[PDB]
Design a protein around this ligand. Structure first.
Ligand SMILES: [Mg+2]
Ligand SMILES: [Mg+2]
Ligand SMILES: [Mg+2]
Ligand SMILES: [Mg+2]
Ligand SMILES: [Mg+2]
Ligand SMILES: [Mg+2]
Lengths: 287, 132, 95, 97, 250
């Protein structure tokens, strides 16, 4: 624009002409002068001028406020409670529209992470993502998605458009590998197995109404229909759909990645995969 | 005999896992506005003196901000050309709603415009009409 | 408190605060009432009801409690089934 | 006060010697080099403060961790005494609580 | 045969490109041999001198380590005993001959040990500074795009006279694509010159551009610089260090 024309007229830019942005630096004040010297802002002789006032929270000898209030367990066990990041249907629809997630293929945590759709902190006790009903009315996509937790209304929205949603469990060690797979391959170790849910979480993941990954497949057809009746839509049949194979794809309950089995080694340097030939090893991984 | 057998066929799944470094360009849609609400810049470009560019995420750069805990403002950021012309248009567009001329700041060095009060939704719709 | 620790050079949390108060992400703090388990036989029915409640803290108490805890206790927590999910935010507040 | 009675000998500075001419080269090694090296790895100095900064108490404790076991007896005695003095100043004294 | 170059990357529709004369060094009069186009987003950014100030100061300060030191009253030799008793003497009260008040005593507030000044500016900010510096040289007519650095003779005098002939500055910075393949003739001529400096493309920095009056870029380096800087725009944040494998990044 016109600004660059000004440069042509003005003298050369050099190390003798530099200037900071105005107001970017304040002035630091030393106690030399009369305004800021003498008593130097500390007051008259006492404990505070000399520099030895009591600590924060001390009230002069009466029992302090933060210790006269009774103890109660608001934060008991906080470091052991499980955490799930929320993913709303507004956010999911937004991501598909801009092309940062590919709806043709199945969607799992790895694909969500790779598109910056979600940020996962395993060291802060994140165990995965839960689908949230907000934005359900305007969801107009057909997809295959796997999440750790789901809500009643969120499941309805996905399926009404002819899609599949399922709930799956990952352990702390597996979750770290899932989010950042490439650094694991650089280590040179075999892929580990996936542990089953703790005892308390077994009822949730073996229940059809939750779309669990360990529930009886025979009972799914009944559950899907009842949602259609309750929320007033017609249950579509996906077997007719051309993409039935994609929508039906599901991984083994002891598998982390779709096309890879426990016990394999990924040699990324020369694009090869190594498999063990020992019966004891094969039996261990397959169990 | 070695204990490992090497196969090259299954590496395709590993290739899927690789993450990208560049933001993908949005995909073409038959019907706009897109179900979320996103709408791409219109073609041909507007002929106004000032041009407003989009962010790396392909959104209109209008932001709500606060300071001191009680001062509410809205910001239009990536302006090229004559920033002063844009100020005149914003004052005319917003003046009837307020009942007074809005208070504004123009930053020529950073090419941004700052307005007192929250007017992000109206400005976003207003800019789309002009087709930036 | 410890402003600069020997081993890491960081501030330290006062753990007697963590055992007595709850912090909502907006900046509020919750507590109980002193004496809510003591000599209930000599307290009226209205007096006992007031004791059972959860109560908020003043501005000066909130300021002091913030200095005595580190940032880790001030983050966003996403607990499934949280019974305080609706109290972490403010609505219709002009201030 | 007393002042010089003669002018000091002149100082002549060569502004195009090798050190001055090539100052700054390779400060963009990462962005222009595909990020194989971080610019901090270009720094020369004490082992315990390469690519790191801290206050005096932090510097003293960091020095002990890196080379504390390879130090002379008397130097180590003084370092330990400095740490305890700085600990009591930064945790018990000052205007602001 | 004009040498015409086009930007490989996509120029924004609303921005017209900018151009400069291609030149050669084989002769004293081969000033113009071609015409070239330069991406507007690199060579036509806004003229921000505050950012140039920041990057220049970062370069100078992030390396600094000061070795100034002083002894406290604890580390000076001697000083253990109380000199005389509190009362009777009629002198001022004193407890050690090595306090700051005494001649030969310790220093109360002096420099302490080796100290570092390290800090890092955000990567996008440092990349932006390079674009602004390149823009400034072009708009002020201090940039000269060249096809190659080949020279007829290795005599240092020839290069100096050429700079006088074409109205160059007293100090010239010359950039070539890579260190290993730099032409033999150029290396011999520059090595004996204080003010004419030869560096590879990866060594370009804001500080050297300010120090040297005129910049000389070969065409292959222009494509090199354009690629790296424009990548910083339209990228994600890093999931992990960029040196690790990525789908589409070297
Ligand atoms: Mg000071
Ligand atoms: Mg988080
Ligand atoms: Mg002593
Ligand atoms: Mg003694
Ligand atoms: Mg004494
Ligand atoms: Mg001395």
């Amino acid at each position: 624009g016109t600004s660059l024309d000004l440069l042509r007229s003005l003298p050369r830019v050099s190390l003798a002409n530099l200037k900071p942005s105005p107001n970017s630096r304040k002035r630091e004040r030393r106690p030399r002068d009369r305004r800021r010297g003498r008593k130097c802002g500390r007051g008259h002789k006492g404990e505070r001028q000399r520099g030895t006032r009591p600590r924060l929270g001390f009230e002069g000898g009466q029992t302090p406020f933060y210790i006269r209030i009774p103890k109660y367990g608001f934060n008991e066990g906080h470091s052991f409670r499980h955490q799930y990041q929320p993913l709303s249907l507004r956010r999911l629809q937004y991501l598909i529209d801009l092309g940062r997630v590919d709806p043709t293929q199945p969607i799992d945590l790895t694909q969500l992470v790779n598109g910056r759709g979600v940020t996962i902190q395993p060291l802060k006790r994140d165990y995965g993502v839960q689908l949230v009903e907000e934005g359900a009315d305007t969801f107009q996509a057909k997809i295959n998605i796997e999440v750790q937790l789901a809500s009643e209304l969120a499941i309805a929205a996905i399926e009404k458009n002819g899609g599949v949603v399922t709930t799956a469990f990952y352990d702390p060690r597996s979750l770290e590998i899932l989010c950042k797979p490439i650094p694991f391959f650089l280590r040179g170790q075999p892929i580990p197995k996936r542990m089953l849910p703790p005892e308390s979480l077994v009822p949730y993941y073996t229940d059809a109404k939750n779309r669990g990954y360990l529930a009886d497949p025979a009972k799914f057809p009944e559950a899907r229909l009842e949602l259609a009746m309750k929320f007033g839509y017609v249950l579509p049949d996906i077997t007719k759909d051309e993409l039935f194979r994609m929508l039906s794809a599901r991984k083994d309950p002891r598998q982390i990645f779709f096309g890879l089995a426990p016990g394999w080694v990924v040699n990324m340097a020369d694009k090869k995969i190594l498999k063990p030939t020992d019966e004891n090893l094969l039996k261990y991984y397959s169990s | 005999n070695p204990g490992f057998v090497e196969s090259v066929d299954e590496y395709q799944f590993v290739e899927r896992l690789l993450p990208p470094t560049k933001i993908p360009e949005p995909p073409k849609h038959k019907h706009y506005p897109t179900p979320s609400g996103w709408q791409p810049p219109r073609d041909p470009l507007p002929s106004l003196p000032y041009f407003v560019r989009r962010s790396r995420m392909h959104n209109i750069p209008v932001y709500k901000e606060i300071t001191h805990g009680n001062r509410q403002m809205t910001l239009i950021r990536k302006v090229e050309g004559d920033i002063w012309a844009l100020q005149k248009d914003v004052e005319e567009f917003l003046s009837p709603l307020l009942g007074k001329t809005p208070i504004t700041q123009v930053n020529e060095v950073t090419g941004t415009l700052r307005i007192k009060g929250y007017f992000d939704e109206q400005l976003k719709a207003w800019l789309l009409e002009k087709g930036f | 408190l410890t402003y600069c620790s020997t081993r890491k050079g960081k501030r330290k949390t006062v753990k007697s605060v963590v055992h007595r108060f709850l912090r909502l992400h907006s900046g509020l703090w919750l507590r109980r009432k002193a004496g809510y388990k003591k000599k209930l036989w000599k307290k009226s029915t209205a007096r006992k009801k007031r004791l059972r409640e959860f109560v908020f803290c003043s501005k000066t108490q909130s300021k002091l409690l913030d200095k005595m805890t580190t940032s880790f206790w001030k983050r966003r927590n996403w607990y499934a089934g949280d019974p305080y999910q609706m109290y972490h935010d403010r609505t219709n507040l002009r201030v | 006060a007393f002042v010089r009675l003669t002018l000091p000998p002149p100082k002549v500075v060569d502004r195009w010697n090798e050190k001055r001419a090539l100052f700054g080269v390779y400060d963009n090694i990462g962005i222009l080099g595909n990020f194989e090296k971080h610019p901090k790895e270009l720094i020369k100095g004490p082992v315990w403060l390469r690519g790191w900064r801290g206050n005096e108490l932090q510097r003293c404790v960091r020095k002990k961790k890196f080379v504390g076991n390879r130090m002379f007896i008397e130097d180590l005695h003084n370092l330990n005494k400095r740490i305890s003095y700085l600990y009591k100043h930064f945790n018990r004294h000052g205007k602001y609580r | 045969d004009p040498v015409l170059r086009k930007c490989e990357l996509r120029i924004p529709v609303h921005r017209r490109p900018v151009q400069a004369w291609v030149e050669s060094l084989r002769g004293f009069e081969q000033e113009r041999i071609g015409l070239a186009e330069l991406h507007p987003d690199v060579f036509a950014t806004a003229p921000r001198l505050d950012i140039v100030h920041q990057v220049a100061i970062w370069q100078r300060n992030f390396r600094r380590i000061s070795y100034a030191n002083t002894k406290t009253r604890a580390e000076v030799s001697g000083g253990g005993r109380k000199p005389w008793q509190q009362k009777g003497s009629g002198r001022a009260r004193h407890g050690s001959i090595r306090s700051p008040l005494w001649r030969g005593g310790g220093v109360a507030h002096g420099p302490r040990g080796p100290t570092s000044y390290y800090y890092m500016l955000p990567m996008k900010v440092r990349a932006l500074g390079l674009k602004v510096a390149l823009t400034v040289k072009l708009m002020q007519d201090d940039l000269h795009i060249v096809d190659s650095l080949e020279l007829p003779t290795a005599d240092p005098q020839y290069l100096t006279e050429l700079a006088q002939y074409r109205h160059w500055g007293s100090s010239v910075l010359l950039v070539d694509l890579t260190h290993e393949e730099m032409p033999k003739n150029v290396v011999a001529a520059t090595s004996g010159l204080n003010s004419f400096n030869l560096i590879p493309a990866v060594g370009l920095n804001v500080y050297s551009m300010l120090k040297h009056q005129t910049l000389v870029l070969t065409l292959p380096s222009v494509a090199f610089l354009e690629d790296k800087l424009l990548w910083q725009d339209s990228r994600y944040t890093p999931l992990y260090p960029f040196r690790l494998p990525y789908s589409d990044f070297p």
